[PDB]
Design an enzyme around this catalytic site. Structure first.
Site, PDB file in Angstrom:
ATOM      1  N   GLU C  62       0.833  -1.191   0.000  1.00  0.00           N
ATOM      2  CA  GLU C  62       0.000   0.000   0.000  1.00  0.00           C
ATOM      3  C   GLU C  62       0.874   1.250   0.000  1.00  0.00           C
ATOM      4  O   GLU C  62       2.014   1.217   0.476  1.00  0.00           O
ATOM      5  CB  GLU C  62      -0.936   0.019   1.217  1.00  0.00           C
ATOM      6  CG  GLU C  62      -0.269   0.323   2.547  1.00  0.00           C
ATOM      7  CD  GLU C  62      -1.125  -0.081   3.730  1.00  0.00           C
ATOM      8  OE1 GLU C  62      -2.230   0.479   3.887  1.00  0.00           O
ATOM      9  OE2 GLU C  62      -0.693  -0.951   4.508  1.00  0.00           O
ATOM     10  N   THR C 136       1.767  -7.989   3.802  1.00  0.00           N
ATOM     11  CA  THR C 136       2.903  -7.800   2.907  1.00  0.00           C
ATOM     12  C   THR C 136       4.221  -8.070   3.620  1.00  0.00           C
ATOM     13  O   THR C 136       5.193  -8.496   2.990  1.00  0.00           O
ATOM     14  CB  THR C 136       2.885  -6.396   2.291  1.00  0.00           C
ATOM     15  OG1 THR C 136       4.003  -6.247   1.406  1.00  0.00           O
ATOM     16  CG2 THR C 136       2.929  -5.310   3.349  1.00  0.00           C
ATOM     17  N   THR C 170      -3.010  -6.900  17.957  1.00  0.00           N
ATOM     18  CA  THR C 170      -3.784  -5.981  17.110  1.00  0.00           C
ATOM     19  C   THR C 170      -4.238  -6.623  15.798  1.00  0.00           C
ATOM     20  O   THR C 170      -4.339  -5.949  14.772  1.00  0.00           O
ATOM     21  CB  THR C 170      -3.022  -4.673  16.841  1.00  0.00           C
ATOM     22  OG1 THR C 170      -1.989  -4.875  15.868  1.00  0.00           O
ATOM     23  CG2 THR C 170      -2.401  -4.145  18.121  1.00  0.00           C
ATOM     24  N   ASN C 197       6.686  -6.373  20.607  1.00  0.00           N
ATOM     25  CA  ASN C 197       6.348  -4.969  20.838  1.00  0.00           C
ATOM     26  C   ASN C 197       6.142  -4.652  22.314  1.00  0.00           C
ATOM     27  O   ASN C 197       6.534  -3.576  22.777  1.00  0.00           O
ATOM     28  CB  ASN C 197       5.109  -4.595  20.034  1.00  0.00           C
ATOM     29  CG  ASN C 197       5.405  -4.429  18.564  1.00  0.00           C
ATOM     30  OD1 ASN C 197       6.488  -4.771  18.094  1.00  0.00           O
ATOM     31  ND2 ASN C 197       4.436  -3.913  17.824  1.00  0.00           N
ATOM     32  N   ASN C 219      11.172   2.459  17.823  1.00  0.00           N
ATOM     33  CA  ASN C 219      12.028   2.427  16.654  1.00  0.00           C
ATOM     34  C   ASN C 219      13.379   3.088  16.905  1.00  0.00           C
ATOM     35  O   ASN C 219      14.339   2.784  16.193  1.00  0.00           O
ATOM     36  CB  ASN C 219      11.305   3.088  15.484  1.00  0.00           C
ATOM     37  CG  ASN C 219      10.048   2.337  15.070  1.00  0.00           C
ATOM     38  OD1 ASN C 219       9.965   1.117  15.194  1.00  0.00           O
ATOM     39  ND2 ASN C 219       9.062   3.072  14.574  1.00  0.00           N
ATOM     40  N   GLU C 245      30.692 -13.915  11.576  1.00  0.00           N
ATOM     41  CA  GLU C 245      30.674 -14.704  12.800  1.00  0.00           C
ATOM     42  C   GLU C 245      29.494 -14.385  13.709  1.00  0.00           C
ATOM     43  O   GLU C 245      29.480 -14.835  14.858  1.00  0.00           O
ATOM     44  CB  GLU C 245      31.991 -14.559  13.560  1.00  0.00           C
ATOM     45  CG  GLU C 245      32.232 -13.207  14.149  1.00  0.00           C
ATOM     46  CD  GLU C 245      32.970 -12.324  13.181  1.00  0.00           C
ATOM     47  OE1 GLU C 245      33.548 -12.860  12.216  1.00  0.00           O
ATOM     48  OE2 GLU C 245      32.979 -11.103  13.383  1.00  0.00           O
TER      49      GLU C 245
HETATM   50  N1  GTP Z   1       7.788  -2.495  16.560  1.00  0.00           N
HETATM   51  C1  GTP Z   1       6.920  -2.120  15.626  1.00  0.00           C
HETATM   52  N2  GTP Z   1       5.966  -3.009  15.173  1.00  0.00           N
HETATM   53  C2  GTP Z   1       5.079  -2.634  14.220  1.00  0.00           C
HETATM   54  C3  GTP Z   1       5.127  -1.354  13.695  1.00  0.00           C
HETATM   55  N3  GTP Z   1       4.145  -1.243  12.778  1.00  0.00           N
HETATM   56  C4  GTP Z   1       3.481  -2.417  12.707  1.00  0.00           C
HETATM   57  N4  GTP Z   1       4.044  -3.286  13.601  1.00  0.00           N
HETATM   58  C5  GTP Z   1       3.622  -4.678  13.824  1.00  0.00           C
HETATM   59  O1  GTP Z   1       2.884  -5.111  12.704  1.00  0.00           O
HETATM   60  C6  GTP Z   1       1.642  -5.657  13.086  1.00  0.00           C
HETATM   61  C7  GTP Z   1       0.574  -5.270  12.074  1.00  0.00           C
HETATM   62  O2  GTP Z   1       0.991  -5.611  10.771  1.00  0.00           O
HETATM   63  P1  GTP Z   1       1.633  -4.503   9.796  1.00  0.00           P
HETATM   64  O3  GTP Z   1       3.134  -4.452   9.910  1.00  0.00           O
HETATM   65  O4  GTP Z   1       1.036  -3.156  10.098  1.00  0.00           O
HETATM   66  O5  GTP Z   1       1.172  -4.954   8.327  1.00  0.00           O
HETATM   67  P2  GTP Z   1       2.246  -5.350   7.201  1.00  0.00           P
HETATM   68  O6  GTP Z   1       3.299  -6.292   7.730  1.00  0.00           O
HETATM   69  O7  GTP Z   1       2.866  -4.109   6.621  1.00  0.00           O
HETATM   70  O8  GTP Z   1       1.354  -6.075   6.084  1.00  0.00           O
HETATM   71  P3  GTP Z   1      -0.087  -5.492   5.681  1.00  0.00           P
HETATM   72  O9  GTP Z   1      -1.073  -5.900   6.736  1.00  0.00           O
HETATM   73  O10 GTP Z   1      -0.516  -6.052   4.351  1.00  0.00           O
HETATM   74  O11 GTP Z   1      -0.012  -3.992   5.606  1.00  0.00           O
HETATM   75  C8  GTP Z   1       1.338  -5.094  14.460  1.00  0.00           C
HETATM   76  O12 GTP Z   1       0.724  -6.070  15.266  1.00  0.00           O
HETATM   77  C9  GTP Z   1       2.693  -4.739  15.022  1.00  0.00           C
HETATM   78  O13 GTP Z   1       3.113  -5.756  15.898  1.00  0.00           O
HETATM   79  C10 GTP Z   1       6.083  -0.458  14.147  1.00  0.00           C
HETATM   80  O14 GTP Z   1       6.125   0.680  13.685  1.00  0.00           O
HETATM   81  N5  GTP Z   1       6.981  -0.844  15.114  1.00  0.00           N
HETATM   82 MG    MG Z   2      -1.842  -7.881   4.267  1.00  0.00          MG
END
Ligand code: GTP
Ligand code: MG
Ligand code: GTP
Ligand code: GDP
Ligand code: MG
Lengths: 426, 37, 428, 201, 201, 428
Positions: C62, C136, C170, C197, C219, C245
């Protein structure tokens, strides 16, 4: 980029659509004369999600206004934000369906189908591709239900893989006008159970309750209820229009909330909702935003969720926030209301964060939820339909326009299967 | 102008090349047989 | 000479990556234009007037997070097709990542990786950041690793994937997305390092006493971790630790590479004014289970291998005194077939503090990455809440009707069950 | 003489600049009328430019900056759409650097007095007021007209409002950012303002 | 250009530095416009800062401080809740040591003169009178807003009143103290005020 | 002494001459009146007091594109009778454009090509820019190539023929016009180079990222091709390549004279200062299959010759170093009877960017012209399109009743299939 195509049917859809585009343009800072004011980048970086440029810089909504009686089209145009739409997307009928499903679906709704599918193809094919459709109509009358759901079917042999938002308002439980309510409601339901990707229902007596005890309005009109619904309209879709720490969209919502394709019915809600004097008296923070949210009064449906069990759930969020305490309170409500959630899906909650609040607020929440408590209000439609069916009443209006008896029996058998599959998940 | 000659009559290159370093941070060390400070 | 390519797939990869590269720009001295007001070579390239463009790709299906980076502050640092974007979100689906959208974006993605890798020999490896719960980040994240093994065979591939919590996830279909990502990265990932997280939320609440931070504050802390891993690649030090290593010292068997991390000191300015920062106690903090990075309790896990990356003004004398203390310490138990258990690497550069952030200016730090048997429990809780929802065909029609067939779930189920048996067998 | 011959700025450029050429020829073989590249003019007078704090800066302050004019109209919906992204491109370009890179001077196609202050309160860059004749000779030089009411001398309208025109020290048309042209690249044409090369010097 | 490009104190900066940098250009390869590191402002002039019992207090009284700027409103209950907390903190921080460490410059959002004297009488640190243009040239510089009424150049709502802003020598935002910010954390963020790094030089 | 004569026919040829001489005037200092305020001797002739005058003929039977040139800015630069105008359009008709309406303009064109090539001996060659799908570009282009072959047979005949694309053809009778034109393009044209429109359409779409490009932007890219073509002929270099070198190094059989073209880098200002466009990073993009300027995919073809010409401050050290990695990669392949396939030319002077165009100020550039077996595909779908519509006598009456005879189509069909049998005979 992604564009959602908006379709409004019935006289209800005309005036919930006018309040919809009033709130969306209020969020986007759009003058009713078509211009933009606000000098902000973050409004105008997503305009094609809902509007189109018209080689003068003015933005036209990608919405289609649909009724068989131009009395409600006249009221939309004459009012404010009625000079935003193109007059070509207003499709006009001259006869009018008098609260008859057979009049709006088979006999006189049919001649306006081919004059409005080319209007759908005007912007759905006018772009490279579209994100999905967003229809909102009425089921109490005929020109909203029969004309609206026939439009839902005919756009799915053309766009089968595309998502289908449908915001359908349901007949009144307690105080119902339009004395032929249940036939039109049931004839909608057994048709939309196989050709709607997700249904999310609205009840007017629920909106009356919201305007009464959590808003304290002495004289709420229909536009007050329409503003409540329109707030949930912008809530479910603004994750596309604005960025956030955890982005989502409508396809995000459908795959996360529909474990089984025959069940896609939702409650809708919106918080915060404060009265006149209580807006300064009440704190605005994410503990109480969720605490008000998962309550019986907050929903826009005539269903008590405590009688049922939350099968899957999703609350999006808006505004300046913080990321553990949006989530761990969904953990808190899953841990206190352990008897109000289903056990064979772990962590039934979807959480998404948008970084832009609505106008006038700094944080907000829009919760949709696939609850099995909605079965309680298919039952009151169903048993009032079969109470009038064995009486053999008012079917000469229906079979006099080219409808068979056996389609009514298929209506009862399909909704009996719909309530039976929801019951065993409790 | 063509590129100029990079060799003298002594038959040796004309310009150095600075070696790819590693961001040298020094270390202060000296011990044994007086073993400093 | 030396260069490392960073790949960020998913918007979790995007948000971890923007803070990861803003620290690198402040670590080497890169203005938001990509100019230096020579260790940039191992993370930033060159193109004339100081233009130190980055060597990283940013995948997302996206556009809603990628093009707002283009609108934001870091426009001209990043090369514009290094930021690669699609149109539609995968939306928490393994099938949507692989077979419907990812097949059209992976051709341009490997086109950019090939151009960005053939610039100079000396490529140590790939640093992968993704979300296994996402669509993704897990689906397209898988198919990138499939196409990287078929061409770039013998190159190292580190991994830092955000595993979901037992509680804060989430999502609801991350039981499907995560265990299909394991069937990807047992046999394609060389070294997998685990993230979680709430294991960063509880560090922010306790170690800094920050009651309401966000995703972006997670981050910074992880950016300090990756910068500490590449501390010796860029800066000089007493013990050099490059990427070759991280695997030959921490991975004893080819199917055993899932491993844990920890960072210390994570101390604000208002707590650094009273606590003395000695090398002995910063590594003692890195051994505490409460200070862990991916919420994996190591009392029932048994440390097979470990790596310590000291960064700052660390004398090697009290490196060896402090690490002798933990061998004496009984509660951190090690394996009888790996009596030695430690690889140490010292770098002289102090950690770089970001103004307006959460951390202070400390003179010494540790980045510890430990392969332990405790990773059995993070997959055993994955066992329990997968079979609890797979048993009644929930959320299955989305996957089966979109290209992928029934039965791939069962063989990925037998894959992580085989991972359970491997960790139990090695832990005897 | 560039890009046009029939413009008030350039015909006053010619009149002034062979005026002193006859004067130094009578004072003194000189080549008259002087060549176009040998021609040097003033583009903005002493009291023309006006930054956001309502104080005046001469033209000498812009040297070393990639300056560009900006013709805009308050009531035009296209102009109200270009204004936020032009503000953002003016923002993130210069913040992300250690040297002032771009500069924008505002020329107005607005009806009257009180409407100009409302539009001018939104941008942080330079501006020229309506009653100055410099605005009139500017859009008759770069040919920026919303409609044909002034008689244009055989040309057409070069571009419609809004537009940004990358200018030089001799009034040179350095590059055109295609907002309303044959490319018609709205909202994205900005991502093509070579901050280098073009440098009012 | 920190922290805001569109800041009006910062365009008042630029008018002065490349004024005199044009002067060494004409007296003497000098870089115009000058690099962002090398502009030197004067933030508080000779008649701006007032101390207790209203004597003139100049800018030379601030070296070695950690100086922060206290935007306040008299009738805002948010300022009323936080003011006794910052009175206690400013006592113990600046007395409990071997040096006079921290310093607070008050800037006002009050309604009129009577509202200024009433709120000033409960603050022992330095302050700025409301009739000075310093209170408005600095309010837009550090992005502090009561409501959206002053026309802005595409800013955000960084903070509401009250706000404490630790500053540097050149108007740089040293570190924000998030009493009302994205942190949303109340009457304890003043403890986050480090002083070793945020020295006014 | 040394001069080259360009020849343009058709509306496409006229505006492709307007772009390549907007560029050549801009690099040689030629104002639109020709007054300088000896390297110009190839394209401009000294006439009088410091005036330099074009060496071409502009040919078109319709006046609608040519007389708007003589009312333009470049009207006191060009000689009036070098721009030769007809009265009526050929109208996509080989029969009119060759026989009927094109016979009263050849007597003026051959008068001017004599008066332009007789001023000095040692003429370097003739260039031809024709529209294959057009009427006068195919008809008049065929007959005057026939008459210049009988007059000047021992001189080079370059041609950059603009071919119709498989999907972009902008007319209906392109099967007749192109197949009839290639009957004589085969027999008396020494060099043929395909310039397909849709290939250059795509190149502007992704490299220069213009998603509404016009025929102007198409024409500038050909101008860069011809500029780095004759850069070695006009200016000095480290290693000269003459126009005579082309046929001796790219044409091993007289029938096979159909080669390809590619220009890289074609980066845009924004994307420009973001890559070290090095003598390699730019020769890898020159050999990229999608960077083709005639959409002939070469992965199913065998390279039988290739010519590369570098233009800028190019050292030949990395010319030989980068062309070796071209030779070693297996995604490219050469036919075994040419173990070497590389002719290199080096010019010191960098290319000059046009203001307001779409390129950027790039220090080094590559133009590459390759003969391949993959010319068989552009003629193979030409076989499909011609027979599919010749089958039931479509548009035949515009040719039979207007000068030619029923049977010219059969032999033009036959000799193109003879070209295919000859190309696959090389292809073993
Ligand atoms: N540590 C950290 N985890 C994140 C962050 N953003 C998303 N996540 C993790 O990603 C999960 C949600 O999936 P996304 O990463 O938003 O989705 P995606 O992997 O990009 O794939 P799509 O759902 O298709 O957009 C959440 O439960 C978080 O645990 C971030 O900025 N920092
Ligand atoms: Mg997806
Ligand atoms: N490469 C290139 N080809 C062009 C261009 N413009 C037109 N063409 C080609 O020209 C063909 C049509 O013929 P024209 O050039 O328009 O007309 P003509 O050559 O004078 O011959 P007539 O059709 O009889 O007028 C098209 O099929 C295009 O392939 C251009 O700008 N660049
Ligand atoms: N949600 C919503 N429902 C409405 C509104 N106005 C009327 N209704 C309901 O719609 C029903 C009237 O049906 P109607 O639309 O007039 O019949 P139709 O014209 O044939 O579709 C009543 O039961 C009302 O309760 C509205 O603005 N919003
Ligand atoms: Mg022709």
């Amino acid at each position: 980029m992604r564009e959602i195509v908006h379709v409004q049917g019935g006289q209800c859809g005309n005036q919930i659509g006018a309040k919809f585009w009033e709130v969306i343009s209020d969020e986007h800072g759009i003058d009713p004369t078509g211009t933009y004011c606000g000098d902000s980048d973050l409004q105008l970086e997503r305009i094609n999600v809902f509007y189109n440029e018209a080689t003068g810089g003015r933005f036209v909504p990608r919405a289609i206004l649909m009724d068989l009686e131009p009395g409600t089209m006249d009221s939309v145009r004459a009012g404010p934000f009625g000079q935003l739409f193109r007059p070509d997307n207003f499709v006009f009928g001259q006869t009018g369906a008098g609260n008859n499903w057979a009049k709006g679906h088979y006999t006189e709704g049919a001649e306006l189908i081919d004059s409005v599918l080319d209007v759908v193809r005007k912007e759905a094919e006018g772009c490279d591709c579209l994100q999905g459709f967003q229809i909102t109509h009425s089921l109490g009358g005929g020109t909203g239900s029969g004309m609206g759901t026939l439009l839902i079917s005919k756009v799915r042999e053309e766009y089968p893989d595309r998502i289908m938002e449908t915001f359908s308002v349901f007949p009144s439980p307690k105080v119902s006008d339009t004395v032929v309510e249940p036939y039109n409601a049931t004839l909608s339901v057994h048709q939309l159970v196989e050709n709607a990707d997700e249904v999310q229902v609205i009840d007017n007596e629920a909106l009356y309750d919201i305007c009464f005890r959590t808003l304290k309005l002495t004289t709420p009109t229909y536009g007050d209820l329409n503003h409540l619904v329109s707030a949930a309209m912008s809530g479910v879709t603004c994750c596309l229009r604005f960025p956030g720490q955890l982005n989502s969209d409508l396809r995000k919502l459908a795959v996360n909330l529909i474990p089984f394709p025959r069940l896609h019915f939702f409650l809708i809600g919106f918080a915060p909702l404060t009265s006149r004097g209580s807006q300064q008296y009440r704190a605005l923070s994410v503990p109480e935003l969720t605490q008000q949210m998962f309550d019986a009064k907050n929903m826009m449906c005539a269903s008590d969720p405590r009688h049922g069990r939350y099968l899957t759930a999703s609350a999006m969020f808006r505004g300046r926030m913080s990321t553990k305490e949006v989530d761990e309170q969904m953990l808190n409500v899953q841990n206190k209301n352990s008897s109000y959630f289903v056990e064979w899906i772990p962590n039934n909650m979807k959480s998404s964060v948008c970084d832009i609040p609505p106008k006038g607020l700094k944080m907000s929440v829009t919760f949709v939820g696939n609850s099995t408590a909605i079965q309680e209000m298919f039952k009151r439609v169903s048993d009032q339909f079969t109470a009038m069916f064995r009486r053999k009443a008012f079917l000469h209006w229906y079979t006099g326009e080219g409808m068979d008896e056996m389609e009514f029996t298929e209506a009862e058998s399909n909704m009996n299967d719909l309530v039976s599959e929801y019951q065993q998940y409790q | 102008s063509p590129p100029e000659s990079s060799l003298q009559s002594n038959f040796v290159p004309s310009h150095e090349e600075v070696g790819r370093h590693k961001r040298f941070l020094v270390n202060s060390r000296d011990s044994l047989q007086g073993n400093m400070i | 000479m030396r260069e490392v390519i960073s790949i960020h797939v998913g918007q979790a990869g995007i948000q971890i990556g923007n803070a990861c590269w803003e620290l690198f720009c402040l670590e080497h001295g890169i203005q938001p234009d990509g100019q230096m007001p020579d260790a940039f070579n191992t993370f930033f390239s060159e193109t004339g007037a100081g233009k130190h463009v980055p060597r990283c790709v940013f995948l997302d299906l996206e556009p809603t997070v990628v093009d707002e980076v283009r609108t934001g502050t870091y426009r001209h640092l990043f090369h514009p097709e290094q930021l690669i974007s699609g149109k539609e979100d995968a939306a928490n689906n393994f099938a949507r990542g692989h077979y419907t959208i990812g097949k059209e974006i992976v051709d341009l993605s490997l086109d950019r990786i090939r151009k960005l890798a053939d610039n100079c020999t000396g490529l140590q490896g790939f640093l992968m950041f993704n979300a296994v719960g996402g669509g993704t980040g897990s689906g397209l994240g898988c198919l990138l690793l499939e196409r990287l093994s078929v061409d770039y065979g013998k190159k190292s591939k580190l991994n830092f994937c955000s595993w979901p919590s037992p509680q804060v996830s989430t999502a609801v279909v991350e039981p499907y997305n995560s265990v299909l990502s394991t069937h990807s990265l047992l046999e394609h990932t060389d070294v997998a390092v685990m993230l979680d997280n709430e294991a960063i939320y509880d560090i922010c609440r306790r170690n800094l006493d920050i009651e309401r931070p966000t995703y972006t504050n997670l981050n910074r802390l992880i950016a300090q971790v990756i910068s500490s891993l590449t501390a010796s690649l860029r800066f000089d030090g007493a013990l050099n630790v490059d990427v070759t290593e991280f695997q030959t010292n921490l991975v004893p068997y080819p199917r055993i590479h899932f491993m844990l991390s920890s960072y210390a000191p994570i101390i604000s300015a208002e707590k650094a004014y009273h606590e003395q920062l000695s090398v002995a106690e910063i590594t003692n903090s890195a051994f505490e289970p409460a200070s862990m990075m991916a919420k994996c309790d190591p009392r029932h896990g048994k440390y097979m291998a470990c790596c310590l990356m000291y960064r700052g003004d660390v004398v090697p004398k009290d490196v060896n005194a402090a690490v002798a203390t933990i061998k004496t310490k009984r509660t951190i138990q090690f394996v009888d077939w790996c009596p030695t258990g430690f690889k140490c690497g010292i770098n002289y550069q102090p950690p770089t503090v970001v103004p307006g952030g959460d951390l202070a200016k400390v003179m010494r730090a540790v980045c510890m990455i430990s392969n332990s048997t405790a990773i059995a429990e993070v997959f055993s809780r994955m066992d329990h809440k997968f079979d609890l929802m797979y048993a009644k065909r929930a959320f299955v029609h989305w996957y089966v009707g979109e290209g992928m067939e029934e039965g791939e779930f069962s063989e990925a189920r037998e894959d992580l069950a085989a991972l359970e048996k491997d960790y139990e067998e090695v832990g005897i | 003489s560039q890009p046009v011959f029939a413009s008030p700025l350039n015909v006053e450029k010619r009149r002034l600049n062979e005026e002193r050429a006859l004067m130094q020829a009578q004072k003194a073989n000189i080549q008259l009328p002087p060549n176009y590249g040998d021609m040097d003019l003033i583009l903005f007078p002493e009291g023309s430019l006006k930054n956001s704090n309502n104080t005046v800066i001469p033209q000498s302050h812009l040297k070393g900056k990639s300056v560009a004019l900006y013709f805009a109209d308050g009531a035009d919906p296209k102009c109200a759409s270009l204004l936020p992204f032009l503000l953002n491109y003016y923002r993130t370009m210069n913040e992300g650097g250690a040297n002032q890179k771009i500069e924008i001077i505002f020329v107005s196609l607005d009806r009257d007095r009180e409407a100009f202050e409302s539009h001018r309160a939104h941008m942080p860059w330079l501006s020229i007021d309506l009653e100055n004749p410099l605005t009139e000779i500017l859009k008759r030089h770069f040919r920026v007209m919303k409609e044909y009411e002034v008689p244009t001398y055989g040309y057409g309208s070069r571009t419609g409002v809004p537009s940004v025109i990358v200018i030089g020290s001799d009034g040179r048309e350095a590059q055109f950012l295609p907002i309303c042209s044959g490319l018609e690249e709205g909202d994205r044409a900005l991502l093509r303002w070579d901050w280098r090369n073009t440098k009012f010097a």
